Amino acid sequence: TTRLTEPQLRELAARGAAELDGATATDMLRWTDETFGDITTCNYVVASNMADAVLVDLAAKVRPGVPVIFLDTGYHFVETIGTRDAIESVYDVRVLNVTPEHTVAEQDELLGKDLFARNPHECCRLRKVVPLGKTLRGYSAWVTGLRRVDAPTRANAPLVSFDETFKLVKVNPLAAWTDQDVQEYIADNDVLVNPLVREGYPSIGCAPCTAKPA
Ligand SMILES: Nc1ncnc2c1ncn2[C@@H]1O[C@H](COP(=O)(O)OS(=O)(=O)O)[C@@H](O)[C@H]1O
Ligand code: SF4
């Protein structure tokens, strides 16, 4: 394939974690681009849930035409797809609509309707984890917008590491960022934001598995 060897990937992740200690998001993205850029012709990808365009704006500022994957499980909001289209049309980013092999009606007919209500782990595996893994096969590193304030279990989220689920380098530039940080960035850069985030939505994901404000 077109992915670096697993020991090489681990040594690169360790070197990046040790070298990017206390670096800004732009510095981490520049390191990722300089390491996995050549040999479009990009060898790293960015993942965005279309809740905002902060990570997308940063990745486009450090690499015009950077690929950005979006996991379209089929249960998304109309506002989420609208935000995806807006980010694609506005920013200099090549988006990828990663879809599962089975549609919503196909899965409802094969394994029963509303799999999220009966077995949510299998639904998330079939529609999110498996397509993400099938897409990441080929990229030596992938960038995520995970922040250490998202959950108490994410407090020790590392800057650069080796994801053992897909076996490749995982880099989180927005890890050290807080709510005030992302607010100030959205204000100073005028980045697109999902309309549901403006309406008081804590998180943005699949419609049946998203905590409603009310
Ligand atoms: N549907 C998705 N499509 C693409 N990337 C996603 C998606 N969901 C999560 N991610 C990636 O993981 C990060 C979000 O992690 P979480 O805090 O756990 O929020 S959540 O939407 O996935 O539940 C995003 O920044 C993104 O890089
Ligand atoms: S969030 Fe819910 S609907 Fe979306 S893939 Fe996971 S279980 Fe299925």
UniProtKB/Swiss-Prot annotation:
Its EC number is 1.8.4.10. Its cofactor is [4Fe-4S] cluster. [4Fe-4S] cluster binds at residues 123-124, 206, 209. One of its GO terms (biological process) is sulfate assimilation, phosphoadenylyl sulfate reduction by phosphoadenylyl-sulfate reductase (thioredoxin). Pathway: Sulfur metabolism; hydrogen sulfide biosynthesis; sulfite from sulfate. It comes from the Bacteria. The keyword Iron applies. SUPFAM superfamilies: Adenine nucleotide alpha hydrolases-like. It comes from Mycobacterium tuberculosis (strain ATCC 25177 / H37Ra). Its main location: cytoplasm. It is found in: Cytoplasm. One of its GO terms (cellular component) is cytoplasm. Catalyzes the formation of sulfite from adenosine 5'-phosphosulfate (APS) using thioredoxin as an electron donor. It is an enzyme of class 1 (oxidoreductase). Belongs to the PAPS reductase family. CysH subfamily. Keywords: Cytoplasm, Iron, Iron-sulfur, Metal-binding, Oxidoreductase. One of its GO terms (molecular function) is phosphoadenylyl-sulfate reductase (thioredoxin) activity. This is Adenosine 5'-phosphosulfate reductase. NCBIfam families: APS_reductase, cysH, PRK02090.1. InterPro entries: APS_reductase (IPR011798), PAPS/APS_Rdtase (IPR004511), PAPS_reduct_dom (IPR002500), Rossmann-like_a/b/a_fold (IPR014729). CDD domains: PAPS_reductase. It catalyses: [thioredoxin]-disulfide + sulfite + AMP + 2 H(+) = adenosine 5'-phosphosulfate + [thioredoxin]-dithiol. Binds 1 [4Fe-4S] cluster per subunit.
